[PDB]
């Protein structure tokens, strides 16, 4: 939707930016590797990878940062970056509670 600057109201939940969304990463890759390169950009609040229900890596990983510049910039790195020859994509984790 659009985004007013004039004025604020409260419409939908609080939405969330400092975390961040990265997809299209290789089964091979370790938590420890994306912390140690994340906490690289900034503060690592939290890291969590998107695992299946026999615990494999589907691709999907969430990072959490202390500040909202740290992780823009982590972002702007990442973003389009090859890890163990493999393309993966970053995305600032904006969309999650479905309103509608």
Same mark, same amino acid.
């Given at each position: 939707?659009?985004? &007013?600057?004039?004025?604020?109201?409260r =419409?939908?939940?609080?939405?969330?930016? +400092? $975390? !961040?969304?990265?997809? &299209?990463? #290789?089964?091979?890759?370790?938590?420890?590797? !994306?912390? *140690?390169?994340?906490?690289? +950009?900034?503060?690592?609040?939290? !890291?969590? !990878?998107?695992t /299946?229900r026999? &615990?494999?890596?589907?691709?999907?990983?969430?990072?959490? =940062?202390? /500040? *909202?510049?740290?992780?823009?910039?982590?972002?702007?790195?990442?973003?389009?970056?090859?890890?163990?020859? /493999?393309?993966? $994509?970053?995305?600032?984790?904006?969309?999650? #509670?479905?309103?509608?």
């Open positions: 939707g659009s985004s &007013g600057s004039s004025g604020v109201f =419409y939908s939940t609080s939405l969330e930016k +400092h $975390k !961040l969304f990265i997809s &299209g990463l #290789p089964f091979s890759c370790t938590k420890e590797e !994306l912390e *140690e390169i994340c906490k690289a +950009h900034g503060t690592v609040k939290d !890291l969590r !990878l998107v /299946n026999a &615990g494999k890596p589907k691709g999907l990983a969430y990072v959490e =940062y202390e /500040n *909202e510049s740290q992780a823009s910039q982590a972002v702007m790195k990442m973003d389009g970056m090859t890890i163990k020859e /493999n393309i993966i $994509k970053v995305a600032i984790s904006n969309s999650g #509670p479905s309103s509608g």
